[model samples]
Target: KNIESLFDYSAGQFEFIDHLLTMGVGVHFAALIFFLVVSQFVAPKYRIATALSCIVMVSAGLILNSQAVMWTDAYAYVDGSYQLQDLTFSNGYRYVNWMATIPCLLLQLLIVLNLKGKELFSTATWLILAAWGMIITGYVGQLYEVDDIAQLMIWGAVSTAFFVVMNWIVGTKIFKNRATMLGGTDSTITKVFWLMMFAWTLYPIAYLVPAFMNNADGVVLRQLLFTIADISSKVIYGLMITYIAIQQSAAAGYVPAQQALGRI
Candidate 1:
C-alpha cells in the first residue's frame, strides 16, 4: 500500500506513542515533586547530584513528549511499520537524554560512596564515557532502517557489555566497602544502589525488542516497555536515592528548614 493511502487509513495510525507520552508527562511531574522533596535532605556534597537528576527527569519528559508530537505530525505507519518520510530522521532524542541522565545517575551514587582525589574524578569520567558509549552504539543500532538484525544485535551486545562492565566496577570497587563509604553496613544507600542496578537491567531487555521481536505490534510493545523502564530507572531509582538522602541527613544531624518542610 502507498504511504499516503496508509496515512489516510485511521486504523493504521500509530497514535499509541502519543497517548503514552501524555501519560508519561504526569509521571514525570510526580517525579519532579519527589525530587524537590528529596532535595531538602540532600547533603551539601550531593547537591549537584540531586540537581542533575532533576534536569534529567525534566529533559526526558519534555523531549519525549516533543518527540511524540513530532512523530505524529511527520511520520506515518506503512506496511505495518512506522517510519518518517524524512530519510535523514533519526531517533536521537532519547540518546541525547540518556547521555545527560546516565552519568548523573552514577554521580548520584558516587556522592553517597564519597570517593575522593584521583579515584573519584577518574572513576566518574570513566563511568560517563562508558554510559555514552552504550547509548551511542544503541543509537546507531536504532538508525538501521531495513530491519538489519545483525547490526542491531551486534550493537545491542556491545551496549549490554558496557553496562555489565560498569556494574562490575561499581559492585567490586566503587561500592565494595559500603560500610565505610555509605557510613554504615545496613545503609539505605545500599538499597538505593541495588535498586538502580536492577532498574538499569531492564533497559537492555527493552533494547532487544527490535532485534528479537520484529513485528507490527513489537513497535508498540517496545515503546511501552521502554517507557516503563525509563520511569523505573529515572524516577523510582531517583526516589530511592531521595530516601537514602533523608536517612543520611538524619544520621548526620541535618534538618530541613521550616519553609522547606512546609513546602513538602
Candidate 2:
C-alpha cells in the first residue's frame, strides 16, 4: 500500500509538471505565429529581415522546447524538488533564448552605426536599445542560481525603466515624426500610442517612490502600477509584436494593400 502511494504521488507530480510545460510551450508558439503575422503589416524598409528575425528565434525556441518534451526521460530529479532537469543542456538552452535578442541588438547597432546620419529619432532609438537590452538581461539572469525575489525586482526595475524612457521618447519624438511624415496631422493610432505611453509611464515613477512616504502607503501604489505594467507587457506586447510583423509583411509587398499610410 505504501509503495502504491509513492507511485501515485510521483505520477501526479509528473502529470502536473507536464501539463504546465505543455501550456507554456503552446502559448509561446502561438505568440510566435502571431508575431510573424503582424510583421507583414510593417513598413517596407524594415520589413524583410526586421520582421523575419523574430520568426527565426521563435522557430528555434519551439523546436528546442518540443524536443525537450518529446524526450520526456531527458529530465532528472534532484533534492526532491523541481530544480534543473538537465543541467548541462538546460544551461545551453539559455543561449537559445539569448538568440532572440541577437537580431534586434544587431539591428539597433546597425542603426547606430549606419543610421546615425539620418537623424531618425531624438533619443528614441537609444530608448529602443535600452528597452530590448533590459529584456535580454533579464532572460540571461534566469540561467543562474539567484534569489528569485531579488531577480524579479531587478528585472522589474529594468523593465520599468525601459517603458519610462520609451514613453517619454515616443511622446516627444516618434509621435512628432509620425505627424510630420504622414503628410500632416495625426491619426487614431497616433493618439492611441500617446495615451498608452502616458499610461505606462507611471511604472518607473511607481518604482522610484518609497513604500511609506509621509504616512501615505506607497507599497500598494507601486504594486498596482506594476500589476498593470505586467499585463501590458504580456498582452499588449504580444499584440504589438504581431502588429509589427503584419505591418512588415505588408511593407515587403507580400500582402497587397489598396492604400497604406505607413509602417513600423
Candidate 3:
C-alpha cells in the first residue's frame, strides 16, 4: 500500500540487496579472526576488550547472513519484476541485531576505560540501558514511519534524547579517561575513539532516512547506511580499543606486547 511494498524493487535492485547482506556476513567473519589473533598483542587484562569485539563479529556475521537469507526468501522474481512472497521482509531484524551487538560494543569500553568499583558498574548499567532505550524507542517510531508521521516524530525525539544523553556520558567518560592513558588525551587512541563516536552518530541519521526518503533507492541507501555503520562501528572501534590495550601493555613493559609492535 506504500513505497515500502515489496513490488517497489526491480529484479536487479532486489538481488543487489540480498547480495550486499551476504557480503556483510563474509566481511564480519573475516575480521573475526583478526580480533582473536590480535589479543596476543595486548596484556591479559586488556584481552577482554578484544574478545568482546570477537563476540560482536560473530553475532554481526550471523545476523547479516540471516538477513540475507531472509531477503532472498521474502522476494521472488516474477516476469521481469520482483514480487513479495509468503515470507515478509521488514527491517525489524535490526532490532535484534542492535540489541545484540551494541551492548558488546558498550561493554568493551569498560575494560580499558579508567573506571573502578561502583562508578564502573553504574556507568555500564546506565549506558547499556540507555542504548536499549534509544533503540527500542526509535524502533517503535520506525514502525510508524510509512503511515504515521506524528508517531514517527514523537518517538524519534524520545529516541534522540536517549541517544544524546548516552553520548554525553560516553564522551565524558572516554575523554576524561585520556588524562590517565599511556599517551594522554592527545594520543592516537583518543583520535580513533573520536572516529568511533563519529561512526556511531551515523546510526540515528540513518534511522531518520525512511522518514524523508522512502523512495525505491531510499531502501537501498538505508541498507547501505546500516551495513557500513555496522562494520565500521564494530571492527574499526574494536581495532581502536584493542590498540589502546596494546599501547597500555607496551608502555607497562609487557615484553610481548612491545615485541608485537617491534616490526612496525
Candidate 4:
C-alpha cells in the first residue's frame, strides 16, 4: 500500500504514538549531545564517559520499546515487534525512559556548568532549561493532545520558540567562547564536530521549506523527514561518541576506563 494511503484518522493515534516514539528516540540522542558538551569540564579527559551515559540511555529505550511491544499485539507493532513482557503490560515505558533522561541530563549539566563558572545564564543552564522545556512540551503534546489540541499547540510553540532562541544564543555567545568553540584540550576536533552539526540542519530544513509549501504527499514527506532525522541523529551521535572516546583516552591516568565508564 502507498504510505500516503496509510495515514488516516482511524490510524491517527498510532501515527501520533509513532511520532512520540521517534521523538523519544530523538530526545535520548539530543540529551546525549547535551551531556557530551557538558562533559568537557567534568573529567576534561573522559568526555566519552558522558557520551556513554547516552549509550546506556539508548539501551534503556531499546529495552523499554521491546518490553512494551510484548504487551500489545506484537505482530502488528512495526517498530520493534519483539516482546518481552506479558499482555496488558502496557507500552508506556516511554514515560519512564523520558523521565530518566531528565535527571541524567541535569546532573551532567550541573557538573559541566560549575566547571565553566556558576554564571546564572551560562550556556549550560539555558541548554538544560531548553531541553527540559522541549521534552515537557513534546510529552504534554503527545499525552494530552486528546483533551486539548489547542493546549498542545500552545505548549509546543513555546518550546520551539525557546529552543530557537537558545540556538541563537549558542551560535552567537557560547559557540564563540574560548572554552566551547576553541581553546579546549581538544579544541581543533571539537570545533570541527560542532560546525558539522550546524551544517547538517541547513540542507534538510532548506528542502522542507518548499516541500511543505506545496501540498505534497504526506506519507512520502513523513518518511523522507524521518530518514533525514535518523541520519542526523546518527551523525551527531557519532560525534558524541568520538568526543567521549577522545576524552577517555586522554584521562587514562586520572580515570581508568572502568571507573570512568561507571561515573560518567
Candidate 5:
C-alpha cells in the first residue's frame, strides 16, 4: 500500500529498512559463491542439491537487490524531511519474487529426497499450485491491508488454508521418506523443516503490520521480519540440504565426501 508515502519518516528510520534489505542482497550473493564451490565437494549425484541452492541464492540475491534500490527511490526529500514520493513504494515486489522462488525451494526438497517418475511430477505440481495459492491470495489481501481489515483477514485465512494443504503434502512426503533418510540426514532435515515452519509463521505477522501501525516503526519491523524469514527459510535450509547431500555422498562411499566429513 502507498500508506508508507502518507507518513513522514526520519532518514535513519527509513535507512534501517534499506540496510536490512541490502544486507539480504549481499548475504545471498555471497552464499551463492559458497554454494557453487561446495557443490564440488559432494559427489556428482549429490551436486544437484547444491545446484538448487545456488539457484535460490542467486534468485533471492537479485530480488533483494532490486528491493533495496526500490526502497530508496520510493522516497523523496521534501519539506526538510524524507517521505514517500508520489510513486508507490509497493511491497508487491516481494510477492513477485516469492512466486518464483518458493516453489523452486520446495522442488529442492523433492530432488534431495530422491522422488522420481510420476510421483515426482505429481508432488511437484501440487506443491507449486499450493504455493501459488498461498502467495496470490496473500498478495491480494496485502493490497487491502491499509484500508480494509475485513478483506485482509479473509484473504489471510484463505492463504493459511493453502499453507495447510502444502503442509500436509510436504509433511507426508518427508515422513514417508523417513525410514530411508533417518539418522543424520533425517535429523538435519527435521530441524530444517521446523526452522522453515517457524520462519513462515512470521510472514503473516509482517503482513499485518500496516493493520497494527502505520508509521516508520512498522516499516522497520516489517522489513526485519522478512529479512529473518528469508535467511532461515532459504539460506539455512539450502545449507542443510547440502549437508544431507554430503551425508548421501559419504554413504555412497565417495572418497572426497568421506575425507571432507569423516568416516561413517
Candidate 6:
C-alpha cells in the first residue's frame, strides 16, 4: 500500500532497470542453453550437478526480472532523486536479488568441488548459511533510513565480516579440499575458484558506493558496477563452470553413448 501510494509508475529511471533485467534474462538463457549442450560432454557422475547449477542461475535471472517489476512498486523518483519507501536511494531490489542468488552461486561452486556425502552436505549448509547472513545484513543496511546512517554502517560492517569469513573458508578450506584431487582438474578448479572470488569482491565495493557518494551517484554507479559484477559472477562464472565440467569429465574418462546409425 505504501509503495503503491508513492511509486512514480511512468518514471524514465525505470527504463534502465527494465533494460538491465531484459539483458540479464537473455544472457542467462543463452548460458543455460550452453550448459545443457555442454553438460553432455561432462562425465556421467558430474553432468547432472553441473547442469543443475545453470538451471539455478536461469531461475535467478527470472527472479531478478520479477524484481524489476517489483521495483515499479517499491521505488520512485522523488524531489530529483530516486527513493524507496520515502527513504532516499534505498535499494531493496538489489539486495533482495542478491539474497536469493548469492547462496546459490556458492552452491554452484560447491557442486563443482565434487565433495561427497556428509562433507558435501555440511560444507554446503555452512556456506549457504554464511551467504544468507551476509546478504541479509547487507539488506538491513540498505533498508536503513538516512537518519540511521550509523546503523547502516554497522550492518555493513557485519555483512563485510561475513563476506570475509566466506572468503576465508572458500580460499583455505575449499581450496585445501580441492588440493587433494589430482592433476589438471585440480588446477582448473583452483583457477575458476580464484576467478569467482575476484568477481565476488566487486559486490561489496558496489554496495559501499552509496555510503561515500550522493544518492544519484550511488544509484547510477552501483547499477552499472552491479551489472558488471552480476554478469561476471553468474554468466561468465557459469561458462567457466561448464568448462570445468567438461575438463573434469574428460579426465574421468567420460564416453558419449554411441547412437545407432539409423533411428527406428
Q: Which candidate leads in lDDT?
A: 5
Work out the TM-score per prediction: 0.81, 0.44, 0.93, 0.47, 0.94, 0.79
Candidates in order have lDDT scores of: 0.67, 0.43, 0.80, 0.44, 0.83, 0.67
lDDT of 6 by residue, 1-264 (tens): 112233343445566765776677677777788777666666776676667667666776777666566655557667765456533323466677766577666766776677778977898788878888898998887665354667778998999899988887777655776765432667777777788778888887776665676354355566667678778888887777666666666555555411111121
Tens-digit lDDT track for model 5 on 147-237? 8878988999999999889988888888787556622687777776787689888898888888887777887888899899999888988
Candidate 4 local lDDT, 1-264, one digit each (tens): 112222222244344445545655566556656655655444443453466565655754464345434323321444443222223333234334534543343333233222345653465566667656655665555343334546656765665665576456444443343253211333444453365346434423423322343222343344345345433434443444444444534454434433544566
TM-score, model 4 to reference: 0.47
| Model 3 lDDT tens row, 1-264 | 233463457877887888789889888899899888878887876788889989999998888888888788877788777787787777777876788788888878877875678988899899989999998998888888678877888998999899888888887887777677773423765676677678887787777776778777888887788788887898778878888888787887888889988878
Candidate 6: where are CA atoms >4 Å away? 1-17, 71-90, 180-183, 257-264
Least accurate 10 contiguous residues by lDDT in model 3: 1-10
User: Which should have the higher TM-score, number 1 or number 6?
Assistant: 1
Question: Please, what are the lDDT tens digits per residue for candidate 1 over residues 1-264?
Answer: 111212222344367766787778778877887787678666776565667668777877887777667657766666666555653223467777888888887887776666667988988888888888889988887655245767777887888888887887777654564765432524666676677677787777766666666555655666687788778878887776665555555556565622343456
- Summarize candidate 2's per-residue lDDT along 1-264 as a digit string, tens digits: 001111212333544545544554565566666656645454554454335445544554464455346425443555563323432222234334434543352343222121234564545356557656655554444322123435545766666665566556545554454433222223433544644565456544553433222112342344345445433433344354334434434434544321343432
Better of 2 and 4 by lDDT: 4
Candidate 5 ranges with C-alpha deviation above 4 Å: 262-264
- Indicate which candidate wins on TM-score: 5
Q: Distance (Å) between predicted and true CA of 252, model 2?
A: 14
